[PDB]
Amino acid sequence: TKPIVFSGAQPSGELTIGNYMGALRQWVNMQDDYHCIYCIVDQHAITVRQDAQKLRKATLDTLALYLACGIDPEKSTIFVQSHVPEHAQLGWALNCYTYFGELSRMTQFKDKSARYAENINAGLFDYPVLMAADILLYQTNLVPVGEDQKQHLELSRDIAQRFNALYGEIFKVPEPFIPKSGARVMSLLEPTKKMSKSDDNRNNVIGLLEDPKSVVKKIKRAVTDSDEPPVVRYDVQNKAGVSNLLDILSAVTGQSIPELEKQFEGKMYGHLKGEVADAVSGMLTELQERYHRFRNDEAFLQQVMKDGAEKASAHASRTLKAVYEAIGFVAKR
């Protein structure tokens, strides 16, 4: 049987080129090599207050966007998190094997709390435990994520090991799969800040479903540096904006930064931004064309959701039963 890949994305905000390069791109390329399972994590999304109509539409938007990226429901399992109760069941049980301090130290909880001081809720704090349940339910070997999720993956490993050490080989210990390019795409006007799918300043982001012409304008206005002469060279410390642009370009074209640096020898930021906008505009145009054929076919989205929840449930129920037997619950009839 193939090793198992699991990963998820929130139906909140609007997925960006950052979400694509750090995660979805890898999701698509691993579908034959591994047994892949991809999740729309609507239970995680509501740790930030959502409008109910927005959340429903965004869940379906996200599903269609997975399909548009090339996630293939005949190859991978695609499902909505709340459709599989085992996620919440194992999440509760794993609370009891997770320490308070492991959660309080989390960068995401601290960043999100500062952004939403009016809604610092227990779900936001408990977020990593539910994520660990997401992963461990499927005997997951590889978890393809961006860099910002490293700390959460590491906790899920610590939980798997702690539980296994008491109870036996109940969980696989997952490993992160973080790309060499595009693991942390940066904001266009603030290249020291991760690109956000919920930025108040849209000029910082390249949304997957955004008008390509709007994206191309945003690329040209991306901040660079004062170097004289202007030089296309990778240096995150001193040339954050140029470096981020090179990263996006490498991640879309598959070309190395060394290659790109040589290609831009004797050129300046106009050539750099012209190729970035060309490559990204082409990607988004093709993506969006596939997207609408999937997004407006409710019967197909309904079918994918149904089959996917059924496949996931068969795996998740097996793991949960072993977990419940190990901790000592009377098994359900």
Ligand X SMILES: Nc1ncnc2c1ncn2[C@@H]1O[C@H](COP(=O)(O)OC(=O)[C@@H](N)Cc2c[nH]c3ccccc23)[C@@H](O)[C@H]1O
Ligand Y SMILES: CC(=O)NCc1cc(Oc2ccc(-n3c(=O)n(C4CCNCC4)c4ncnc(N)c43)cc2)c(O)cc1F
Ligand Z SMILES: O=c1[nH]c2cc(Cl)ccc2o1
Binding residue positions: 10-12, 18-19, 134, 146-148, 185, 194-198
Residue 21 lies near ligand X (rule: CB under 6 A): yes
Complete DSSP assignment for 174-228: -EEE--SSSTT-B-SS-TTSB--TT-S-GGG--BTTS-HHHHHHHHHT------S
172, 194, 218, 273: which is the annotated catalytic residue? 194
Helix (H) / strand (E) containing 47? none
> Among candidates 16, 33, 11, 251, which has minimal Cα distance to 142?
33
Q: Look up residue 262 and give its two tokens.
A: 């040589």
Residue appearing with tokens 């909140």? 12
Q: Looking at 37, 260, 305, 312, which residue binds a copy of itself (CB under 8 A)?
A: 305
Please give the size of the binding site for ligand X, defined by CB under 6 A: 25
Please choose, out of 6-14, 208-216, 225-233, 298-306, the segment that lies near ligand X by the rule CB under 6 A.
6-14
- If the CB atoms of residues 12 and 243 are measured against ligand Z, the closer one turns out to be 12
Among positions 121-150, residues that touch a copy of itself (CB under 8 A) are: 121-126, 129-130
Are 71 and 25 within 8 A, CB to CB? no
Measured CA to CA, the distance from residue 153 to residue 21 in angstroms comes to: 18
The tokens describing 181, both together, are: 């390019």
160 binds, among ligand Y, ligand Z, a copy of itself, none (CB under 5 to 8 A by kind): none
CA–CA dist 315, 280 (Å, integer): 37
Quick one: which of 7, 16, 98, 224 contacts a copy of itself (CB under 8 A)?
98
The answer to whether 139 contacts ligand X (rule: CB under 6 A) is no
Query: Out of 54, 150, 197, 321, which one is annotated catalytic?
Result: 197
One-letter amino acid at 162 equals R
Distance, in Å, from the CA atom of 113 to the CA atom of 135, rounded to the nearest integer, reads: 24
The interface region with ligand Y, picked from 3-11, 66-74, 273-281, 316-324 by CB under 6 A, is 3-11
Identify residues 117-136 at the interface with ligand Z (CB under 6 A): 126, 129-130, 133
Q: Binding of ligand Y at residue 249 (CB under 6 A)?
A: no
> Which residues does 216 contact at the CB level (< 8 Å), separation at least 6?
277, 280, 281
Amino acid identity of 296?
A: N
Q: 184 touches which of ligand X, ligand Z, ligand Y, none (CB within 5 to 8 A by kind)?
A: ligand X
Among the listed residues 50, 224, 243, 244, the single contact to a copy of itself using CB under 8 A: 50
Choose from a copy of itself, ligand Z, ligand X, none: what does 19 bind? Cβ within 5-8 Å by kind: ligand X
Phi, psi (degrees; rounded to nearest 5) at 235: -165, 95
- The answer to whether 156 and 131 are in contact (CB under 8 A) is yes
Q: Is 43 in the site for a copy of itself (CB under 8 A)?
A: yes
Residue positions forming the annotated binding site for ATP = 10-12, 18-19, 146-148, 185, 194-198
148 makes contact with ligand Y (CB under 6 A): yes
Q: Which of 55, 88, 231, 287 binds ligand Z (CB under 6 A)?
A: 88
How far apart are alpha carbons 157 and 207 in whole angstroms?
A: 32
Stretch that binds ligand Z, among 90-98, 149-157, 182-190, 220-228 (CB under 6 A): 90-98
Binding residues for ligand Z (CB under 6 A): 88, 91-92, 95, 126, 129-130, 133
Catalytic residues: 112, 194, 197
